[PDB]
Structures are given as structure tokens and as C-alpha cells.
Amino acid sequence: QISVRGLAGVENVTELKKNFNRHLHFTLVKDRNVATPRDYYFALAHTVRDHLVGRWIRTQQHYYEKDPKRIYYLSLEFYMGRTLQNTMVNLALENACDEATYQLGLDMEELEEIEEDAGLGNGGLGRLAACFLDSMATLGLAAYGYGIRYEFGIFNQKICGGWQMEEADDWLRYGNPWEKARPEFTLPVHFYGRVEHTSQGAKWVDTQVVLAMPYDTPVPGYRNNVVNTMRLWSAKAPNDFNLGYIQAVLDRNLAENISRVLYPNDNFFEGKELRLKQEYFVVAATLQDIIRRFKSSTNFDAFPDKVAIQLNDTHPSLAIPELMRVLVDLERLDWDKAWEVTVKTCAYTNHTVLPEALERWPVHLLETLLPRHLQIIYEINQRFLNRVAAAFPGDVDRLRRMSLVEEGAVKRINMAHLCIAGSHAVNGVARIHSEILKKTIFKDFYELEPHKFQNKTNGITPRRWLVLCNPGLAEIIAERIGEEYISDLDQLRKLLSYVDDEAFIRDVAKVKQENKLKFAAYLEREYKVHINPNSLFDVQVKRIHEYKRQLLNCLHVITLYNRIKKEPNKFVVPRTVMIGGKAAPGYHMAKMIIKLITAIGDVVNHDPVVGDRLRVIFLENYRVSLAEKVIPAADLSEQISTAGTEASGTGNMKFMLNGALTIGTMDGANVEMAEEAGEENFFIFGMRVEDVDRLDQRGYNAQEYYDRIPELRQIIEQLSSGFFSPKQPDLFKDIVNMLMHHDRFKVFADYEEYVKCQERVSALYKNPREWTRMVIRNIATSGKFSSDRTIAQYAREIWGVEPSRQRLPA
Amino acid sequence: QISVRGLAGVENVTELKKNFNRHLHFTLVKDRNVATPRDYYFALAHTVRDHLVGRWIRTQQHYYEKDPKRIYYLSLEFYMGRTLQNTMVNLALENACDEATYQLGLDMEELEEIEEDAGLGNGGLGRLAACFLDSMATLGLAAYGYGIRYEFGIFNQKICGGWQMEEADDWLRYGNPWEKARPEFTLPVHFYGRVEHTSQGAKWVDTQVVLAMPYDTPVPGYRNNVVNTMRLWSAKAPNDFNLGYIQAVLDRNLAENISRVLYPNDNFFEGKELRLKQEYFVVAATLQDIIRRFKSSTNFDAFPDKVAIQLNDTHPSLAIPELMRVLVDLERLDWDKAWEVTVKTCAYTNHTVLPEALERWPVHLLETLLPRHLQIIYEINQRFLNRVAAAFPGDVDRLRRMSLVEEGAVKRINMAHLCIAGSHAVNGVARIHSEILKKTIFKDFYELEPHKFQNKTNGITPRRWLVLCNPGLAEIIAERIGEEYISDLDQLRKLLSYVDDEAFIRDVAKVKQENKLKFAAYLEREYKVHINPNSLFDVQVKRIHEYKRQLLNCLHVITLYNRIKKEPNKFVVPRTVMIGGKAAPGYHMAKMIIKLITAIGDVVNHDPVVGDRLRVIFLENYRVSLAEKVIPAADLSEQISTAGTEASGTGNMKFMLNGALTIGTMDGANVEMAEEAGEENFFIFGMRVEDVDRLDQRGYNAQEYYDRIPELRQIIEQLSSGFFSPKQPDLFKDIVNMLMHHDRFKVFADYEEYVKCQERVSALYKNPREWTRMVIRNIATSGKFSSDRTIAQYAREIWGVEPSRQRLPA
Ligand SMILES: COc1ccc(-c2nc([C@@H]3O[C@H](CO)[C@@H](O)[C@H](O)[C@H]3O)n[nH]2)cc1
Ligand SMILES: COc1ccc(-c2nc([C@@H]3O[C@H](CO)[C@@H](O)[C@H](O)[C@H]3O)n[nH]2)cc1
Ligand SMILES: *Cc1c(COP(=O)(O)O)cnc(C)c1O
Numbered sequence A, B: 001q002i003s004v005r006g007l008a009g010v011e012n013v014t015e016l017k018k019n020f021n022r023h024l025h026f027t028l029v030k031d032r033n034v035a036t037p038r039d040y041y042f043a044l045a046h047t048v049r050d051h052l053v054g055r056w057i058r059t060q061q062h063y064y065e066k067d068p069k070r071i072y073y074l075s076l077e078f079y080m081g082r083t084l085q086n087t088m089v090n091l092a093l094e095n096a097c098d099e100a101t102y103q104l105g106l107d108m109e110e111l112e113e114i115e116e117d118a119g120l121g122n123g124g125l126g127r128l129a130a131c132f133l134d135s136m137a138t139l140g141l142a143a144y145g146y147g148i149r150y151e152f153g154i155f156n157q158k159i160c161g162g163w164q165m166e167e168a169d170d171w172l173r174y175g176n177p178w179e180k181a182r183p184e185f186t187l188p189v190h191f192y193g194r195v196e197h198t199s200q201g202a203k204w205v206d207t208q209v210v211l212a213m214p215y216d217t218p219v220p221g222y223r224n225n226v227v228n229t230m231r232l233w234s235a236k237a238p239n240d241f242n243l244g245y246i247q248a249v250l251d252r253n254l255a256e257n258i259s260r261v262l263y264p265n266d267n268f269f270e271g272k273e274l275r276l277k278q279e280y281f282v283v284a285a286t287l288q289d290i291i292r293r294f295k296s297s298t299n300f301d302a303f304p305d306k307v308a309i310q311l312n313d314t315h316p317s318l319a320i321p322e323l324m325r326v327l328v329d330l331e332r333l334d335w336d337k338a339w340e341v342t343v344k345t346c347a348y349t350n351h352t353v354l355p356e357a358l359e360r361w362p363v364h365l366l367e368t369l370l371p372r373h374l375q376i377i378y379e380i381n382q383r384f385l386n387r388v389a390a391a392f393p394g395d396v397d398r399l400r401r402m403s404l405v406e407e408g409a410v411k412r413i414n415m416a417h418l419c420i421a422g423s424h425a426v427n428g429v430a431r432i433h434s435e436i437l438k439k440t441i442f443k444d445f446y447e448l449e450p451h452k453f454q455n456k457t458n459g460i461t462p463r464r465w466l467v468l469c470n471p472g473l474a475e476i477i478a479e480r481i482g483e484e485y486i487s488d489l490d491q492l493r494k495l496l497s498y499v500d501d502e503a504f505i506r507d508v509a510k511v512k513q514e515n516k517l518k519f520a521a522y523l524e525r526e527y528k529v530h531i532n533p534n535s536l537f538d539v540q541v542k543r544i545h546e547y548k549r550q551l552l553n554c555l556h557v558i559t560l561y562n563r564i565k566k567e568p569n570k571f572v573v574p575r576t577v578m579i580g581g582k583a584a585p586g587y588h589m590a591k592m593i594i595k596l597i598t599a600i601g602d603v604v605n606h607d608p609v610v611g612d613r614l615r616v617i618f619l620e621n622y623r624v625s626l627a628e629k630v631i632p633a634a635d636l637s638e639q640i641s642t643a644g645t646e647a648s649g650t651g652n653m654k655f656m657l658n659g660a661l662t663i664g665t666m667d668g669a670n671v672e673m674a675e676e677a678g679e680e681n682f683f684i685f686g687m688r689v690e691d692v693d694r695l696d697q698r699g700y701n702a703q704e705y706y707d708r709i710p711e712l713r714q715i716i717e718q719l720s721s722g723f724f725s726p727k728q729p730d731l732f733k734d735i736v737n738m739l740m741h742h743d744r745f746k747v748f749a750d751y752e753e754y755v756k757c758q759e760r761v762s763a764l765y766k767n768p769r770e771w772t773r774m775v776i777r778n779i780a781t782s783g784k785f786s787s788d789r790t791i792a793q794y795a796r797e798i799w800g801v802e803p804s805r806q807r808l809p810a
């Protein structure tokens, strides 16, 4: 049907049909009389998987023969989502599979909906890792993603009585056709024990052993026949583990719990032993695998020429002392040489400045679990501080600030300090964030070693986030400028020459309208709710956190409601306000915010005076597959974090690419988006970073805003008095008390500017031609935010490898 | 090469090679340059599996269309062993696969050795279930085996310093290509809770739910294109289970532990809650599956016409009250009608008279775990005892003896009594055993309902236990009488006409010699030990238990050793005495017996005066795959249980079929073997059951035998004084004390007759022609001991179905 989905040749379609029927019979052991839609999904997934394997084998063979520098991307999170459609897109099989399944009496879109998300991440950080793997494959880099194969990913969210309930995400229940277990490359990982000092070096002895079993998942590049590997480790007990008899076997679960479940905190550090075990587990297994591959290419001088290790935040920071341990204790390198190799191999990406998100591990935990690593950390620290003292003689407070070891009631190791000391490059994830790192939390380190500090602004893959989720938009773009933009997103600039083209304006608006209709029907089918698809779709989807300011959005929604009730017969631009996202299970305020959003909905959606002019919907179970549906349907993207808090954001970029306008603060990558599109094509409001600093110096007093803004006072009085919770009048007192007395994120300080800016949004929406022209200017300038651009910069400026768009032979 | 392995046609071999290469590439994602022997095994297993699937689908379809009476064989144990070779034998693919792999540069016998045993049983009871599944498929019965998919089967045995050590049997580590998960037919199983009485019936409420997920394994019949199903349940927690957050997810292991591990006790009852959970789990899931299939054929009068449930001992006895629960509480049948249906549906096989093996569950356990089942059991008991009281008025002691409820400090439910009350047929497993049931432990029940009591003598499948393990013997038989005997083992009687045939005598002895050479080399390769293959191979392999009297064998071995040392220059027939088997981990005396056997070996095998005239070998890790190697190599089969203790035995039958002579007591099926072969062709010794009873009446005094038999006194003095344990002189005092003062199995009472009978064995072995003639007379009369005969009797006399040797279309 549409060109960007590829060719459906007679031979190809005939062969797909044959192989589908072969898998249904031989692989699934079903016939057509008893097959369910799930069986049909698996038959198609195996059929498509077969097309990957030849390319996967040949790619890995090619890397063995050419021996390029290898890139290892270490992350505790990979938020992959579904694989079937992405695989078809990257192999140019989508139209062929559509036609094949159509001829078998099946709807391929219905089969796609059966696949579980691989939800092995919390949000942005994990999804960035996934976009990066796609870009690395598309750019022909010899890259490997290494992580943990969690049995349970991010929990499934249910809303009961307006409250979040959590259910385990049993994503492996029906099997995962995309992974290949490799039990033959299983490796041992050590814990506990003690250190003995012999005459020739330290020895780590009396340890408990857990096995790391790898599962490999293919990562196809975009139409280049490159298939890279994501290797995820699963924990297994050895067979003599604890070996009355029955209890010893049952106790194997203690070892296997390491890979059982993803910690569900976004931007928050929980210092639990189990999490530390996960961090070491992934590092120890991965580093053995790296060294094995390096020796099968004595001379570790060449190691940094053949290996780059990228640390996705501090979560895999133990890679630094582990590499030192292996090189010094096992390979018998002198300390100075081992350190040179380590620093040249490792690079660190920081993703947050929030103090509660930074990993600071208690020394007593490390002492018990990883006694040799603690010794190595202390030695790193002493050598590092000796350098500081030589550069800044007499500056004793600098020595305290820069130490890897923090003093206090409980001594802690600051893992960010460890990463900076042990890495040749340290980057933030958007220009403003990288500047904040140099001016504030890592200022001292920047003064010592300015050359280490870089910026790499984040991006998103346009395969998943345009072609896959919004084929209608991809097609109308391709009709004008061809298909090359899918792997060279800067070509979207050519669309600026179509900003006054009446046919293009029409087509852009038509695609948005279709996407809104399709989403409005999805909502009715799966969740029994009636929305007006002519209304402005105002969307805020992301994890629930105080810094992201869903509460500010709530205040605007109540303002609109109160304005309608005051003047019911005045025209207002109709809106559907959709908010979705998961709260971390232990984060009380985030759970209270969810309840507030649903309680506002309960009032607003049932008030007959409001009608269809305002609807408030909480989108349940926000995840990658839901993002693919709602983002193409959005008109307005809410990116309203307090300036200085959102390191980058990536949702922001997904909305820009898909034809929504953005209302946002000058935070993270929003700054760069506005710069690319022009400030006149962005709805910017609120305090800049400098304004927040000025408020913090005099002292934030929320009472001043309450006293001066009557519309704001009315809302607080409604919240306090039980207007949105008549049966439990004090339900929201924690929210009110926080806003009035200990709001770290200054919700009231941006309220007035936010409401005024929202009125400008509504004014523009009344003129559909000018709204759409502004949209075209956004889509046209979104090219910088391709993760292909981001990865090319990492490759050239950090890893020292050249990207390639050349195809391997098929 | 050999005819019974089938045809190797050019087309077949070409297609096998293609499919092997397809699986290596697409299924395993390997090329020939990096493939290991394990990859080659999996490629062949998938290739052979593909030949099963069409037949499996068509067989199950045929049962749906014809709607025959269905047979459900419920067992906690299925000791399957390896599947690859058995599959090839039953599909006539062995020579074709041999040729295909040969042309690919691979040795198929080497690939076969890579497969793990499916070790989901302890010994005879579990292996009987496996032979039965093979026979049911070969006889065209619509039969299903139902059990538990244990993650860990019977432990792997290691010998360290002469002691048994246990290691977990992680049989699923590399995957199981033979099973198909069916997560779509997952069913709930309930535990705990309480009973509420409403106006219309009892309700079992407030229960904890565990899911039962089925995995299906194909069971091919012998060259008839029938493929039946073995369905094994695995335990899964529901997704809301216990739903801080992290701990709730980790605690899912509590539910999933139900299917984690096989209880490793042979002939011993351990009354643990976890075992009770396993028993109910298998019953509750299976019965729902049975009822579903019955309703998809209101009218439960027809249920016993369409369903037979065979209880493999009392382990699945909760099927009786569960069926009553479903019919009364859920289907709303009146009690009397439900009971009629239950009795007509269920039949019970008893496999032991040892009092410590009989299941007697504490009432307090049932009350907490299965409160509704306990109520139903009490009602069954009251109704049953009302019948007893009407038949035997005033016989109050009979009421006490027959009750399902045993009085005492702890009230217990006698599950054997429950099975008899609720079953239309009760059988023992050999003629002597079935007679013992009627005369002793179930005498009262037999007097009430004589019509219920039957015998079904055990058997073994001649596919695994002749064709598969001893192709050389199968072939020389086939050269004379054709191939029909493989599915009609009574045809072996035709071999009596070849007892004086010089060529046949030669060939039988040649095959034995080859098997001994092959086993002698296996021992050198895998376990670094030098045995004389011209020696008589004297073999006792079976679980270690006091009743099986490995200790009596030990006493004979020491006797031979002492006789050699007394007269070193006299000729004695050389022997290699091999003993193997696992001890239950908590069974102290069994572990001490293993240590005694290895300690005897340590002395005997290193005494230079003995030379190669006597060797004592402990065969480590005895299991089904080791049985397939050692049984074809044996000359003498040791079947020496105290009369009245071995309900049947099946090892005995395996040795008879494979050309060993038997030294044995008149116990279990040995009685029937001697009757079939003639007593003159069997080495019978020792007390009969009647002699044991006479000794028990006067009192067994072991001291009398010590005082009268100088050779026996010498052995006890050697054991006591530390001759076999010089560094730990008192090591064997528990063994000595047991033999002298509390030997329940009367080892000393059979010593003299046993040693004299062993001298007759040695005398016959000196005349190889007459030894071999006696062997032919044994093999020729082994036909009764086919499990095809056993299953045909169950079918006709218990299940009410007619067996069929007709082929389904291919
Ligand atoms: C399990 O514990 C944690 C899980 C995640 C984070 C984390 N997530 C991000 C997000 O990273 C994105 C990708 O760079 C940014 O776009 C986003 O601004 C940031 O909040 N920063 N930090 C921190 C601890
Ligand atoms: C896990 O707990 C148990 C496991 C097994 C048994 C058992 N095994 C047999 C053996 O059954 C064989 C098949 O009928 C007989 O040949 C054998 O004589 C008997 O001991 N009888 N009883 C009992 C409890
Ligand atoms: C992109 C994405 C995120 C990150 O969104 P932000 O608005 O940048 O926080 C979180 N979750 C999912 C499922 C995503 O696809």
C-alpha cells in the first residue's frame, strides 16, 4: 500500500506464506483448526526471525575477520519495547509480510498487538540505550549492548479506585522468540570472601559463586544487512550450591534472585544490597567476555585501541575497579600501566543532577560484598587526591569535596567521582546539562581536567519513532523528498520549502486527524471512554515525578474548569488533556499525584455544563507500545520541568518529529529544540535556570503567589476543602502542604506564565492553517535529534571509530 | 548396517541431511566453524522431532473424531531417560540418521551421549510408568500420562572418599527439545482457605491460587504412527501474587517451589507439607483437564464409559476426594451418584508392603491445606464403615482396622484405605505380591469386596530394553525368527528350537563378549579403571536399601576374598563384582553400605595376591542411561531381596531379556521368571515367604548364625576390628550392630545357601557351552515380561478397552 513499507514481490510473498505454515506446523505444533491469534503471532515472528539469522552470523563473522575496534555499551536498562514491526521495518519486509498474512486471512496489525513489550527499563535512560543500539547498527559500528535479563521488567500499572496498583510484568510467560540462550558461554561471578596478601599480590578467596548465562538478541540496522548483538546475563546457581537435601535445592533461588526484577525507580537511588549485586553481576560477566574476545583477536597496551567501554551513568561504575582487579591481580600488570589502560578504555555519561538520584554506596556494604574492590577504590582515591594536592596546593577543602570517599555518620563511596577519575571522557546529555555539570556539581573536576568534559545531546531513532509509529507521516514526507531521510534525518530541512504549499499543509493536517481518530477508537475499545477527536489533544506522558511537574499541568486543568464554570456560555477551544505515566512503588507523593489526576477527571468529565469542551484522561500503563500510539496523535506536547532538572528529555523529541507543538520551559534539550525551530515556533514560558538561582538566593516563599493570584488561591481552597474528594475531604492535604511549604520545584512560581502561554496555544489552534504551518517548521528542523547524529558524535569524539553507511552483502 | 535399525534410502538420507543443516543454521544460529558436539546433538534432535509432529497432530485429531474411552495414568514419577534413540527406533529412522550423520562427518553414537536423562523418578516405580507409556502407544490406546515437570530430577551421585555426595540434576539447563509448553491451557489450583456452608452446598473460599502450566512431550508407538501425550505440570505464581514491591516479586518462589524438585526417597514415606502440595497440584490440574476434555466430546453417568483414571500407588490418591468435590460442590450431583461415578472411574495399583513406605498423612496437615478434602474424606469413611458394620455385625475391631482414619497421638489418614474404598479395581504387581495383599495388609478389604482384587504382573518395554540397548542381540534373534517379536515378545519361544544349534550358541556368546568389551572400555575412558573382560560380570544395580540386601552381596564378596587369601594358588573362576545405585540423602544406613562397598574395593582391588581374579567396582550415578550400558554386559543378575519384600522388581526382567542368568530369592516377579524358564535354569536360593514367617514366629536371633558359621564369624570380626577401615577402626560398627541385633531383613539367615548357590554359578561358568545354552532358555522364555502383555491385561480387565496393533496412516 505505502512506499516506505517496501516491495511485496510474488516470490517473496509466496516464500513468506510457506514458511509461516511451516512454523505453525513444525514449530508451534498446531493446525489452522485450533490455532489462536497468539499462535499466528508466533508463526509470523519465527518467519521474520529466520531472515535475521544469516545476516547475524555473517555480521559477527565479518567482525572476527576485520577485527575493528569494539564498542561495549554497558547499561542496567534496555527499554526495547516490541521487536516484530521494528525487525520488518529494518529488513524492508513490512509490505511483504502484510500481503502474505492478508492472503492467509489474517490481519497483521492485530498480530502485532499480541507481542509483549520487553520492558527492561524505567523510562528515558533505558529507552536511550535502545535507540542507541538501533543507531549503532545502522551506522555499521561493531557494537554490543550488555545488560541483565530481568525475569520481571517494569511493573504493569492498573488503576483501581483512582489509585495505582502494581502487577508483575511476566513478559517471558509465553516465551521470547527473539533471544537465543547461549548456556555454553556461561561464566562465574564472585561475591563476598576475603582478601589474602601473598608475596606476589592480593588474592580474593573464599568467595560465593553465581553463574552468568548469556542470552543474545539480534539488533538489525536499517537496510544495511548489519545485525549486532544485545547480550543479557541471567543468574544461575552452580549445581553443588549449598550441597537437608530438599532445602539446599530450594535455596538456589537466593543466587538466582540477582536477575529476577528491575528496580522500578526513575531518578532515585535506593541503596539496597540486591541492587549492588546486580551492578557487579553485569560488570563482572561482561568484562570477562570482553577480555576473552580481545585475547582471541599478553599485550594489554593495545587494549584501548580495540575496546571502548561506555558507562550508562554510574550504574556499571564497578567496571573501573573490576578492570583494575583483573589487570593487576590476574594479569600481573603494574598499577600505573593498568590505570592508563583503564582510563583510555572507559568513558562515562551522566544523566542527572538531582542529589537523590546519585549513587553513593555505604562502605560497609562494599566491604562485605566486594572487599577487593573496596581496597582498589581506596588506592584510586589516594592516588587521585595526590594529583589534586599537587595541582591546588593547600586547598584542603577541595581535597574533601573531590574525594571518592564521603565522610559522615556512614562513610559512602561517591560513584560519580569514581567514574570521572577513571574515564577519559565525561559527557552530559544536552548542552544546558553539560554546562551545569561544569559550573556546579563537577566544577572541581572540570578545573583539574577540563579536556575530559564533553556534551553529547540525546536523540531518538527515526525508525521506531517515525516510520514504525507514524507511517502516514513518513509516506507524505517521502512523496516530496524521497526515502533517504530515514537514515539522514537532516534531510527534513528540505520540508521548509513546502511550508506555503497548500497540498502539503492539507496532507500534514489530514495525517494528524487520522492518527487522532485511530487513537480515539483505541480508547473506546480497550478502555470504554468517549473523547471528541476535534478537540486539541494536550498530552503529558512520562514518569510521575515532582520535578516533571504534572502538578503544574493539574493546576492549569482546574483553572480552565473554573473559568468555564464562571462563564459557561463563552466559547473556549475544546481540549482533551491526557496525562500518563508510572509512579515508583515507594514514592508516596507520585502516587498521590496520580490520585489527584483521576479525581479531577471524576469531577470534570461528569459536569454537564462542561460538555465535550474539557476532558481529563489518565492513560493507564504508559510504556513504549503506548507511546507509539499516543505520540502520533498529540497536538500539544507538555515539557514543563523546572529549569535545571530534566537533564535532556527524549519524549520531547518524539513529539516534535510527529507533528505536535511544544509548550515547555527552557530545560534540557527543549533549549536546543527551540534553537533549531526558532523561538517563534515554540511555546516557551517560565523561569530560566538563572531565575531559579535568583529565587533560591532570596528564598522561595509560595505564600506570596497564593496571596497575589486569586485564581491560584481558589484552586488551593478547592483542594483543601474537599471539592475533588467529597467523601474524604482531607485526602489531598499532603499535596497542599507540600505546595505551600516545601516545594523544591517551584510550581507556583511558573503558574502565571504557564496559564498565559496556554492561552496563546488555544489562540493558534483556532487557525488550523497557521497551526499546521508552525508544525511543518518543527518537523522540518527536528533532524538534529536523530540518535544517528548522537552516535556519530560519540564515535568520532569519544570512541575513536568512523561510522559507515555502507551495506554488508546480503 | 543391521536390519532391525531400518532402511537408509537415498531420498530419506538426503532429506535428513538438508534438515540437519537447516536446524544448525536457523534453529541453533551456528555455522560448522564454531559448532560443538552439543550443537550437533540439538540439530539432530530437532531433525528427528520434526518427524514426530505430523503424527502427533493426526493422532490427537483421530481421538477427537473417534472419541474412544480415554486412559489417564496419574503418577508423581516418570523415569524417561533419553529420548533421541528411542524416537528413532520407534519411527524406523535409526539407520537413516546414522548414514546421514556419517556423511556429514559425525558419529551419531557420540551425539547420543550428550543428551541428559530425563530423571523424573527414583527407580522402579517411575521407570514402570515410562515403559507403560511406550506400551500404551504401541497398543493404540488413547492414553495420557500426567505428572509434574520437576526442575530438578533425581540427584546426580558423586563418590568422594568412598562416600555418596549429591548434586542437583539441572537437566533443563541446555533446554529440552522434546517438550512443548502450552501456556494457553494453564489452570488454577487452590490451597488453604476455609469451608463455608450455604443453603445450597459447601463452598471452598479464601484460597491461595497457584497456576499449573502444562508441558507436553510426545510418546511414539512402535512403527504404528501413533503418538500419545505425556502432560507434565509446572507451577507458576499469578501476576497479582502478594501484590514492599521488590520482596513481593521475589516471594513468587514460594508458589513456584511446588514443582522444583523430586523427593528422592525410594520405598519410604516422608510426610512433608511440600510433598502433599505436589500431590494435590498434579491431581487438581489433571482432573480439570480431564473434565474439560469430557465436556467437549451435563450427563456424568457416561463419565466412566469415557474416562479411566489409574492411580500409580497412593501418591495421586487425592484424585478420589477431588473428583467427589468437583462433582458434588461444583456440578451439584447428589453424593450417591457422584460416588458411583468415582468408583467406576478410578483404579489403584499398590507397589509395596513395607510399612515405612505407606502414606499416612497427619490430619492437621490436611485440615490446614485442604479443608474441604478432609471433610469429604470423613464422609467417605463414615459411609464405608456403615457398610462394614452391616456385613460384619458386632466386629468392632474390624471397624478400627478398616477405618480410613487412624487413631493415635497424631490422627492420620491411611491413603491406601482411601484408594481401596474409592476404586473398582485394586492390583498388585506380581503374583506373590497380589497374594500377600489378600492374605495380610488388605485381608479385611478382600473379605468385604473380593471382586476388586487383581494381579497385573509388571513388565518392561522390549523397545528400550532390547532393541535400543542391545542391537547385536536383537539382530541375531531377527536373523532366525524375523522382526515381529519386537511387538509380540512371546515369539521369543521360537528360540527354544535353537538351543542345540552350534551357530546360534556361538552368536549369543559372541554378542555378550562384544557387550562386555564395550562396557570394559567405557569404564576405562570415563572412570580410569582396569577390568578383565574374560571374568564373570556379577552385577547388582538398583537403589540402595536394606531390603534389597546389597549387604548380603558384600558378605559373599568378602568370603571369596578370604578364600583366595587362605589358598592363593588354587584356581577360582575370575569375577568382576559391580554394585551400583543411589541412596536416599537422609538414609544413613544406605550411605554406610555405599561406603562399605568402596572400602571392600580399596582392599580387594589392591591386594597383589588376588590379581585379576576378583575386582569390586562401585558404579557411580546409576540411572537409566547407565542401565542401558551395563545390563547388556552382565553375566549374572543379583536379585536377592528377602522373600516378601520386593513387590515385583523390573531390573530382574531387563537382565533376563539381555542374556544374564539370575541368582535370586523366590520374591516378587523372580517367582514367575523361574516358572517361565524352569527352576533348573535359574539359581534359586534362600528362605521362601513361609520360611520367613516361621522365623518371625520363633524370633530371629542373628547370634545363632555367627556362632555356627566360622566363615561368617571371620567376616564380622574383620568388619568390627577395622580390617576394611584401618585409619577409622570403628567406622562400620553401626552395620555390625544392625546385622547382629536389629536386622529386619535376615541377612545372616540366607548367607549359607547364598554362598553355596554362588559356587554352582561358578561351576557352570567354567563350561561356556552349557552356560550359553541356559542363557538361551532364559531369553526364549522372557516373553511374558513384556509391558505390552501387562498393558493388554490392564486394558481388558480394568479399563474396559481393546488394544490394537493396527497402524494409523502416515
Ligand atoms: C534505577 O535508577 C535510576 C534510573 C534512571 C535514572 C535516570 N534516568 C535519567 C533520564 O535520562 C534520560 C536519558 O539521558 C534523560 O533524557 C532524562 O532527562 C533523565 O531524567 N536520568 N537518571 C537514574 C536512576
Ligand atoms: C517417593 O516415594 C516413593 C517412591 C517409590 C515407592 C515405591 N517404589 C516401588 C517399586 O515399584 C516397582 C514397580 O512396581 C516394583 O517393581 C518394586 O518391587 C517396588 O519396590 N514401590 N514403592 C514408594 C514411595
Ligand atoms: C521516551 C520515553 C520516556 C522518556 O520520556 P521523557 O518525557 O523524556 O521523560 C519514558 N517512557 C517511555 C515509555 C518512553 O518511550
Ligand SMILES: *Cc1c(COP(=O)(O)O)cnc(C)c1O
Pocket (backbone or CB within 6 Å): B122, B123, B124, B127, B541, B542, B543, B622, B623, B624, B627, B648, B649, B650, B651, B652, B654
Ligand atoms: C529398572 C530400573 C530400576 C528398578 O530396578 P529393580 O532392580 O527392580 O529395583 C531402578 N533404576 C533404574 C535406573 C532402572 O532402569
